[model samples]
Target chain A: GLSDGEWQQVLNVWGKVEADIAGHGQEVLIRLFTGHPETLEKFDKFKHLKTEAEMKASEDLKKHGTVVLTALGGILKKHAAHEAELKPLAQSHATKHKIPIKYLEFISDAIIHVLHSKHPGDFGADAQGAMTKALELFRNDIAAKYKELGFQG
Target chain B: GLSDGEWQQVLNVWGKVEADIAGHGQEVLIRLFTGHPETLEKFDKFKHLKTEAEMKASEDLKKHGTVVLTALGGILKKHAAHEAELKPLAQSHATKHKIPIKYLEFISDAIIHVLHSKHPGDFGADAQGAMTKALELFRNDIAAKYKELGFQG
Candidate 1:
């Protein structure tokens, strides 16, 4: 649902996103867990961390977070023509993982907070707007898949 | 040193900032704590929290957090012409409180994250950019005053 101008703004900052895939991506997942620590209950890998120190020291946490963002990075690099990537990922979650769609959005919302905070120069309001809409568009596509498979997003 | 146009973006979103100063402000402070848990050692009031549940339930935390944002609210409401508000407050910290200026920035960074996250509709990249610059300007002004009193910030 992004216009040409909006897509341009996201594309404009796309390089930075590409450059710091793990640094940025892992931080978003970390932020998600840090802000809503209980959500780790969903992550069998991370739910074991009972102490703040453990979370901070978590290599597993870092890898998992990076994987989530890297997955997003792979899809976003293809732009809207990411159907091949989006479908299987969405379907797997819909059919098996069955993670609630809200959790997906929790990360999306948290991701923008990290991105906007981290990249202050090029990722301004226009960039954030484009990115926000862009993420929402992707989320919607995934939700569409969920619905197609008789799942509720 | 914002241009006329830059200040306007801040002014454009100024109302919303004023409207939820505490909600927005406290969350920023909370975010700072969540992100940098060690910083609580600086806060005698909050340093006692050893558990996440304690933080989520603490009324004192909420009040202190609200006070911080509300304090900033008073200064920002006066706009750039806010020398009266800025000077005494900056001086107090320079004389007695002696909080590191970088820690001041910790709140500003966290504030932008919460603001950008909470008010996505109006708080786009441009708004975030303006606020980031605006906060930096204030921090610099305070740092200038710190140096005036023979202190390094």
Candidate 2:
């Protein structure tokens, strides 16, 4: 649980950062796809675009990136109450999409990386810790669904 | 080309349909996937889910259907002048996503079927004809982009 001060820092950093969420989301995905090429295999529409340049120019990438960023924006809107909403999505990713749990962890890291790179000194340790904890909680909620479903991956 | 009255009818039908465009879009995608299972093959995220019930219950389906419908709603907002907006998307779908033009044609039929089924007699031949022509034009605009790009698909 975040202390009131920690939560305030999280909210403050998010407020400063939210305006650029879409581009940030795109950057995260570009990192995720480029750093972990296996993630691209999960998207048939994406698998063929092997190079970062190709992926960057893709409208499909933009759409998916926008969707991810918009969903994250929704989570921020709801604060800590986003768990209920994110659980089903996490379950679906595990059960249906067959996305590994590690990828979820990796995505969180990618998001953190984007925040640090984009916000620089403003996203200091306190802000980083708060967001990291928040994502960890969300990832736990998702992991709980995987446990319930006995999803080995 | 639509008669002015025909265009009005198309717009009127869309007005009703747009109120529940996400739901309508879901039904259309369900129809498209069920009616043509091969379409699912194009989406790695979707191909494994073999049942309509599974598809209907999917968050991914809901998200994608909403996107498609929302985009359509925007086109309707532009009246018959949506070509300027839709051309780039068409080009991207063909060149980037590599989605075959036939699937695009199939999706148009699915949308028309949903409009007719959901609205019953309200979507009469005039409205249907107008919508069909509109979709055909949209499809052509997309295909033209494919031609320009030398997209063999």
Candidate 3:
């Protein structure tokens, strides 16, 4: 759990970064798939794109990125209270999509990278800690659902 | 082309609507597809969903809606300047998707209906006229592409 000060820092950094979240979110996915090209196989629509430029220009990729950032905005709005709303999505990711937990970690890392480059001053150690902690909680919660489904990943 | 005041109204209304575009975008699609069930046939991902509730709960629907509204926001930002950027999408819709122009008209009506209901007082004749004009421009430009592709409908 984040201290109130930590949570406030999280919100503050988000406020500064929110305007470009969509673009940054797209970059995060692009970076992730570029770095780990195998992960691209998970997305039916995006898997066929042969090049980074094609992936970057993909409308489907942009849409998926927007959904992710919107959900992140929702989490920022409600913080812990928003966990219940995300549970089903987590379950779906874990069970229905069978996305390995490692991908969640990759997302966190990619988002952190984007933040570091975009808002270097605001995304200091404390903000990094808060964001990482938030993602850890989120991944763990999703992992719980995966465990329940008896999926080994 | 919108008058200066009409453009201001578009920006002003969008400022108010921007915060909830994700949710409102979803509602627009749901309302459109629900009101015109045949329209769902155009979306391969959505065609199998049997009911409004299913569509509402669909992550696919949510993603597509978010994409539509995000691109709309981008267009709203650039206005006339963005027309060049949208040409490919317009062509794709007309050629690749082959969605009839009437569905585009239906979407405009559905979006207008949604805006009216969500912001009853805020969406007035000026706003309505401005939005309708914008959609007409979009559809016309897209239809231009459809025509270029030798499509009759």
- Model 1: how far residue B6 lies from native, Å: 53
In the range B34-112, model 3's lDDT, one tens digit per residue, is 6556656656788888887898899888888767556544434443233333454556566665557766565455545
* For model 1 chain A, the run of ten residues with the poorest summed lDDT: A72-81
Model 2, position B40, has a per-residue lDDT of 71
lDDT (tens digit, per residue) of candidate 2 on B41-125: 6576788888889988998887787775565344333433333344546556666666677665554565455445544454566
Q: For residues A5-37, could you state the per-residue lDDT of candidate 1 as single tens digits?
A: 444444434345456655544555555556656
Ten contiguous residues minimizing lDDT sum, candidate 2 chain B = B75-84
Which rank order by TM-score, best down to worst?
A: 1, 2, 3
What docking class should model 3 receive?
Answer: incorrect
- How much is B120 displaced in model 3, in angstroms? 58
Indicate the DockQ of the complex predicted as candidate 3: 0.02
RMSD of 2: 27.0
Off by over 4 Å in 2: A1-153, B79-153
What is candidate 2's lDDT per residue for A54-108, written digit by digit as tens? 9889887777765654543333334333333445565667778775666556545
Please list the residue runs of candidate 1 whose C-alpha ends up more than 4 Å from where it truly belongs after superposition: A81-153, B1-153
